[PDB]
Amino acid sequence: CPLMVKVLDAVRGSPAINVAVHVFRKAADDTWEPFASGKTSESGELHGLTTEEEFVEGIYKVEIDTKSYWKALGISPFHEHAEVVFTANDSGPRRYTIAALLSPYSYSTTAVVTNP
Amino acid sequence: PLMVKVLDAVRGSPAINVAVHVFRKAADDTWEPFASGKTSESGELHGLTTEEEFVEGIYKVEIDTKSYWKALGISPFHEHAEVVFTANGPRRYTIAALLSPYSYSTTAVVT
Amino acid sequence: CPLMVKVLDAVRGSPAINVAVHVFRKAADDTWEPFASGKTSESGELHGLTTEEEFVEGIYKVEIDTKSYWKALGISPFHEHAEVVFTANDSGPRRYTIAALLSPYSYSTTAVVTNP
Amino acid sequence: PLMVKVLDAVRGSPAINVAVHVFRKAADDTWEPFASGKTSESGELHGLTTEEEFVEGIYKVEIDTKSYWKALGISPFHEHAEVVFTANGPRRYTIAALLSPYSYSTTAVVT
Ligand SMILES: Oc1ccc(-n2ccnc2)cc1
Ligand SMILES: Oc1ccc(-n2ccnc2)cc1
Numbered sequence: 001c002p003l004m005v006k007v008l009d010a011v012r013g014s015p016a017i018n019v020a021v022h023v024f025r026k027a028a029d030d031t032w033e034p035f036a037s038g039k040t041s042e043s044g045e046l047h048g049l050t051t052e053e054e055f056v057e058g059i060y061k062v063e064i065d066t067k068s069y070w071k072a073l074g075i076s077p078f079h080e081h082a083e084v085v086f087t088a089n090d091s092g093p094r095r096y097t098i099a100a101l102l103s104p105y106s107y108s109t110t111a112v113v114t115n116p
Numbered sequence: 117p118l119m120v121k122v123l124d125a126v127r128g129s130p131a132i133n134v135a136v137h138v139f140r141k142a143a144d145d146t147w148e149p150f151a152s153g154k155t156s157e158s159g160e161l162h163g164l165t166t167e168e169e170f171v172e173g174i175y176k177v178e179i180d181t182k183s184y185w186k187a188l189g190i191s192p193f194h195e196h197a198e199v200v201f202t203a204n205g206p207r208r209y210t211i212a213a214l215l216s217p218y219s220y221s222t223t224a225v226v227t
Numbered sequence: 228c229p230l231m232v233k234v235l236d237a238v239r240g241s242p243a244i245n246v247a248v249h250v251f252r253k254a255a256d257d258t259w260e261p262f263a264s265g266k267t268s269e270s271g272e273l274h275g276l277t278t279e280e281e282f283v284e285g286i287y288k289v290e291i292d293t294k295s296y297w298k299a300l301g302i303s304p305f306h307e308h309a310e311v312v313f314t315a316n317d318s319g320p321r322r323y324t325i326a327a328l329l330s331p332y333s334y335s336t337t338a339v340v341t342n343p
Numbered sequence: 344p345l346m347v348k349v350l351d352a353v354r355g356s357p358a359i360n361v362a363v364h365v366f367r368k369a370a371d372d373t374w375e376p377f378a379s380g381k382t383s384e385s386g387e388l389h390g391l392t393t394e395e396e397f398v399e400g401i402y403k404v405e406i407d408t409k410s411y412w413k414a415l416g417i418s419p420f421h422e423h424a425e426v427v428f429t430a431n432g433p434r435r436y437t438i439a440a441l442l443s444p445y446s447y448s449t450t451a452v453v454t
């Protein structure tokens with residue numbers, strides 16, 4: 001588990017369940033290439049995106065599909081997605097947890113980075 | 117010297133007509149009323165105090181979030197938000213809060 | 228585990244370890260009475276505050292000692308504490324997780340409430 | 344029609360001299376430069392666009408948080424913050440962001 005994503009819903013006070021998450025990695029030609037994707041569980045967590053072998057150094061983008069989440073709850077949200085873009089593993093492998101907190105017109109994200 | 121600004125993360129708007137009470141901690145560790153008001157159409161509450169009144173000490177800003185949410189028909193978690201801080205050269209304090217039904221964030225802008 | 232507290236540090240990207248947490252409950256005479264206290268672990272979590280028997284309906288205050296946390300890291304913070312005040316168990320027992328994210332001049336908190 | 348405001352949660356201040364670039368999504372799903380500037384002493388960036396230029400569509404506001412933190416000597420996690428949204432009666436948009444080294448929050452104030 002070198003990359004984990006956790007999503008919470010600030011309106012309902014609950015995990016944000018069935019949220020699609022797409023991860024990209026910057027290629028040598030400076031475009032975003034697909035890297036991994038998945039969906040949050042009933043706990044709001046997404047494990048198993050990648051492996052220690054696959055998760056090399058690079059610039060990664062995690063795009064959390066908040067628009068589809070809100071629309072499925074019958075709410076018209078503001079943002080297309082929540083995200084982080086970050087350089088990973090530059091000083092060696094780390095474990096990253098990306099935690100996102102969602103409201104219809106707002107989001108916040110934090111990273112928890114541990115060594116391992 | 118002290119301004120409060122409140123935003124609503126659900127509706128994407130200023131939080132209007134929110135009651136705010138400020139207290140200063142007394143020598144017996146109790147909370148003495150100090151200033152209060154309601155946020156304006158811009159979500160701001162100006163005019164709470166004067167330089168001469170606002171001395172160093174511990175202050176509590178209580179934002180009545182529960183009444184706010186209920187007046188909008190939205191189910192809230194917190195009773196209120198209580199933002200407690202120590203006031204310590206030339207300085208103006210803005211206490212800013214961003215509200216959601218089951219979460220809030222606050223930050224201080226000290227200039 | 229009907230009440231859990233998790234604290235994260237937004238400056239370091241880490242759990243906030245060894246953070247004191249004090250929980251109070253409003254008494255019949257409208258004052259705050261002590262209810263429980265503890266400290267976050269190396270994961271930033273605090274389990275074992277209370278029990279299903281002890282955690283009755285009431286208005287609770289969770290005071291997270293953020294000032295001592297920052298001061299121990301050699302930083303002068305703004306707030307005395309991070310907190311939540313909430314009515315608990317009004318529609319029957321629930322499990323509450325209070326998640327706090329700390330910066331020297333800011334904090335945010337969220338509640339995750341589950342039935343169980 | 345579009346304003347950006349940035350706050351610093353570490354120093355308790357406006358985030359001053361932060362580069363901001365706005366992009367509009369083109370028909371081929373690429374990001375076409377639209378507006379840019381640097382936040383002022385108040386943390387605000389006004390004058391990005393005009394009513395006639397700001398049409399419905401998908402916009403990205405990229406805030407260069409990494410350069411901000413490094414100019415303050417503080418070690419940052421994100422490359423930048425990318426705030427992407429759809430613009431849809433009379434409306435003004437404020438994109439507000441609160442920055443910490445390993446976290447940011449953003450909200451929209453639509454009036
Ligand atoms: O599991 C989580 C998710 C989000 C969190 N958060 C993000 C911003 N504020 C809290 C905290 C913990
Ligand atoms: O969680 C927050 C709070 C305040 C914010 N802000 C208010 C004014 N400028 C940024 C943004 C995000």
Ligand SMILES: [Ca+2]
Pocket residue numbers: 057089090091092
């Ligand atoms: Ca390297």
Ligand SMILES: [Ca+2]
Pocket residue numbers: 172204
């Ligand atoms: Ca002093």
Ligand SMILES: [Ca+2]
Pocket residue numbers: 284316317318319
């Ligand atoms: Ca009851």
Ligand SMILES: [Ca+2]
Pocket residue numbers: 399431
């Ligand atoms: Ca339309």
